[PDB]
């Protein structure tokens, strides 16, 4: 298989105008579950999730997220009192794991305050990295509970990966298909690719035999139909002809377009 990932995000907003809590799960780029403080229900965001998970799953996790929502509100209260901040501020959490092609795995868990890194977990040293002293105070409390850290490591390395495999099988028709890119060159040379899945794609320009960087890269954008599009541009020297070629790598296939 290609590289896949599972990550769950939580957002807390302290003085919302708009939910004060949101939690969404992804497999790769695909939303799979959603919850917010308005609906107070955990719901599938993909047909192959709804199809494969019984009502007791959604019932159980609905209850857990109602609790997590409260814990998030309280932690947000503590961070703002300590930063001595007034007004609306945000608190975010990201957890998840990757299953790489070679079978190796990664695992990560992080927190953010106003969209900046706050606490980053290290499952190998069983420790927390703090970006400032408010974060340092929390670190010391969290690190004093050894069992919780150990719990975090086990979940990231085993449970997260097992969940990910389960979801991969649920949505294999979606997650494991390949739609190769359509690639053309426009004229300043633009190399355009579209209609491809997965979104991971590598586009670059070469001048003669060396990788040219003076290249302008377009972002990888959703086309709204489940496929993606992107581009990369370079500027042609007006005074000396060169051999320019667009190179595209996508799902183990390399492609060259010479001009």
């Amino acid at each position: 298989m290609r590289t896949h990932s599972l990550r769950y995000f939580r957002l807390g907003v302290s003085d919302p105008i708009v939910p004060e809590f949101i939690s969404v799960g992804y497999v790769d780029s695909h939303p799979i579950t959603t919850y917010d403080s308005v609906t107070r229900q955990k719901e599938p965001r993909a047909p192959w999730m709804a199809e494969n998970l019984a009502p007791d799953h959604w019932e159980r996790y609905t209850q857990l997220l109602r609790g997590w929502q409260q814990m998030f509100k309280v932690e947000l209260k503590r961070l703002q009192r300590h930063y001595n901040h007034s007004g609306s501020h945000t608190y975010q959490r990201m957890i998840g794991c990757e299953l790489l092609e070679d079978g190796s795995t990664t695992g990560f868990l992080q927190y953010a305050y106003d969209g900046q890194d706050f606490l980053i977990f290290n499952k190998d040293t069983l420790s927390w990295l703090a970006v400032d002293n408010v974060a340092h105070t929390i670190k010391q409390a969290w690190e004093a509970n050894q069992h919780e850290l150990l719990y975090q490591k086990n979940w990231l390395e085993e449970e997260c990966i097992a969940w990910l495999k389960r979801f991969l099988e649920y949505g294999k028709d979606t997650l494991q298909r390949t739609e190769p890119p359509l690639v053309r060159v426009n004229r300043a040379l633009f190399c355009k690719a579209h209609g491809f899945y997965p979104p991971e794609i590598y586009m670059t320009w070469m001048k003669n035999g060396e990788e040219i960087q003076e290249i302008d890269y377009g972002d990888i954008l959703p086309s709204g139909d489940g496929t993606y599009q992107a581009w990369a541009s370079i500027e042609l020297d007006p005074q000396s002809s060169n051999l320019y070629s667009c190179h595209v790598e996508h799902s183990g296939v390399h492609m060259v377009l010479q001009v």
Partner: antibody
Amino acid sequence: GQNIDQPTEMTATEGAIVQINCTYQTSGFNGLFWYQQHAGEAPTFLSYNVLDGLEEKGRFSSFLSRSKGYSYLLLKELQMKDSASYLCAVKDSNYQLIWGAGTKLIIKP
Amino acid sequence: AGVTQTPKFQVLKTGQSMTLQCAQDMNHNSMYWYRQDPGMGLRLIYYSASEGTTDKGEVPNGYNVSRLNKREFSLRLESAAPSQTSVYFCASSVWTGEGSGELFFGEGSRLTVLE
């Protein structure tokens, strides 16, 4: 998960050592707890394992093998007050607790 | 004080209503009601993940509950049955979901239901 197994009853001698087994077959794993319950009383927390290994805490030790799906509670230098039931509990993938039927430990003075 | 539940003992005739009380002064978010019967492990009746929500456990039939506030979680027997003869345990934890958090148990309530 599905089930937790621990022996119904164990009898050992004062001063000696006893090892209480707990095997689990569960849907996912988020930790194994041991609780002590004296006859007619509330169970109370003894230990927690989630990664492989042995964790010591006084006369009591706790072992875990995730791959073998078993844990044991080790009691050294047994005293009469260790007479109690010991309850094994596992947290599954959905953070729900599955409880063993308990092991009643009897100490011969 | 920990977890306080009442009554310590109770006799009930078949068909009778009953309410078990439980409070915890540890500012815990999660509370639970279990029953303990000979030859089997604790079975969850109902639980409350945090203030404001409750849900069925493994054996909800015959029972219902109320998370009255953050401290209190009472268990109700609708129409007492002989099979509901048991020892009932209230428990609480700081937060369910937190993987390594232990339960704190109350002293138990011994119920005997007779025809």
